[PDB]
């Protein structure tokens, strides 16, 4: 599929045969089903040559095609990505970010985007080559959708990576631009902006403060109401991420009226959103009494219970966390309330689950409650715990008994204790 003619022209000294050849290359390499990448790479010096074509300051069309070629080579395979990196493309692609021909700029940013998104290794490499300053510099001017779309996408790929994550200090300088992009109308730029924010907000509290300090929470929360699931998903996660910080950090999210938005998402058709929303709510009901109260006030717990009865299992797991979290940080009056909505039942039904973890969550919730009813007992009565009866009639007592057969020792013991404690066993 590759001729000697194409090779002779490539290596000759007339910028006309060079270009005409380069085009034949990319057009062939643009064949979805199996580009003749092996041959191209096989013929020696070809890649190194395409790279040298990138240096043709005076030739917009030649540079443009060469970068297009190297891209089709690199994009879609880690090994050939290595080959292109190894020829020295990256430093030059970066150079082309600052050329008078914008098309060359767009193409370069794209290429770099593809390279950095190939792996942790490549991401960290492209950054080490200072892609950031010139890349961020592109946003300064009014650029066409396409130029912006590729730009922000590049950033996304430069922020992506959880193991290992990039040196935060290398990707944080893009935070300002990100928050700015959250006000663009276009859903692609919007989505990818959230993604990058979704990435930066994932980690320790010092990193979360950085995101918060950029001033994104308001707009982020505002975006949970967006109609398109492709921008709601990453926004939700970024929001959700932020509320993994301390009470003070998660109060910032609360102060943006995220709760009513979240309540809305619990009715969302997309299970992915429900789950993610419960998870978020869970991390809020894991805060201080006042924050728990704010959740109650947002009228959210009615929805969490119905979610524990209708929604899918992997979603229910999250909702169960929200409740139990409330039960351990909540006040007597607060717990009383959850029980009033009949949260004992949903917890009970999770006692005999496969996930050893959710079992503990369910046991923890039921214990906390019983601890209350143990209080209400002495302070009035006829002091018999009001709650272990409600538990008995929810078949929880049966399940707690059974659990005395669980593989996990600690769980066995808990069930044993709860019984001997709040019920008794001859």
């Amino acid at each position: 599929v590759i001729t000697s003619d194409m090779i002779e022209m490539i290596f000759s000294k007339s910028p006309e045969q060079q270009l005409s050849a380069t085009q034949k290359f990319r057009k062939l390499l643009s064949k979805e089903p199996n580009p003749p990448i092996d041959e191209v790479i096989s013929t020696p010096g070809v890649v190194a040559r395409f790279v040298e074509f990138l240096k043709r300051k005076e030739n917009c069309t030649l540079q443009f095609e060469s970068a297009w070629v190297l891209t089709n080579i690199a994009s879609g395979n880690s090994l050939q990505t290595r080959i292109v990196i190894q020829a020295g493309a990256v430093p030059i692609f970066i150079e082309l970010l600052s050329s008078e021909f914008e098309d060359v700029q767009e193409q370069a940013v794209w290429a770099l985007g593809n390279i950095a998104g190939d792996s942790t290794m490549c991401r960290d490499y492209v950054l080490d080559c200072n892609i950031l300053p010139p890349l961020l510099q592109l946003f300064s001017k009014q650029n066409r959708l396409t130029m912006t779309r590729n730009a922000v996408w590049a950033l996304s790929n430069l922020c992506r990576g959880k193991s290992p994550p990039p040196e935060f200090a290398k990707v944080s300088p893009c935070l300002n631009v990100l928050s700015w992009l959250l006000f663009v109308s276009d859903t692609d730029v919007l989505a990818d902006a959230c993604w990058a924010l979704s990435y930066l907000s994932d980690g320790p509290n010092d990193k979360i403060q950085a995101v918060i300090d950029a001033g994104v929470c308001r707009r982020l929360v505002e975006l949970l109401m967006h109609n398109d699931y492709k921008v709601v998903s990453p926004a939700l996660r970024a929001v959700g991420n932020i509320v993994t910080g301390d009470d003070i950090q998660t109060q910032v999210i609360l102060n943006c009226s995220a709760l009513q938005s979240l309540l809305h998402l619990l009715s969302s058709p997309k299970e992915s959103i429900k789950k993610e929303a419960c998870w978020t709510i869970s991390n809020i009901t894991a805060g201080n009494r006042a924050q728990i109260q704010t959740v109650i006030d947002a009228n959210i717990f009615p929805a969490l219970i119905s979610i524990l009865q209708t929604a899918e299992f992997r979603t229910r797991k999250e909702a169960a966390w929200a409740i139990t979290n409330a039960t351990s940080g909540g006040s007597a009056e607060q717990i009383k309330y959850l029980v009033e909505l009949g949260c004992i039942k949903p917890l009970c039904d999770l006692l005999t689950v496969m996930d050893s973890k959710i079992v503990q969550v369910a046991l923890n919730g039921l214990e906390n409650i019983l601890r209350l009813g143990e209080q209400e007992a002495k302070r009035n009565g006829t002091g018999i715990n009001p709650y272990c009866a409600l538990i008995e009639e929810a078949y929880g007592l049966d399940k707690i008994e059974f659990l005395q057969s669980h593989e996990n020792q600690e769980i066995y013991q808990k069930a044993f204790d709860l019984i001997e404690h709040y019920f008794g066993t001859e």
Partner: protein
């Protein structure tokens, strides 16, 4: 109930090439039981019932 870390980071990372896959589907299942030998070993209880 004073100064614990109830916060839970997300399990899997979500990306632009990842978010909409509708993963697997969870199996509720039954909790893993203990080995016959251990089962007899430990002492069980029969909750006092009423109402």
């Amino acid at each position: 109930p004073l100064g614990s870390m109830a916060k839970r980071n997300a399990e899997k990372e979500l990306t632009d090439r990842n978010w909409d896959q509708e993963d697997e589907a969870e199996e509720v299942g039954t909790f893993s039981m203990a080995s016959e030998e251990v089962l007899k070993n430990r002492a069980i209880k029969k909750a006092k019932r009423r109402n």
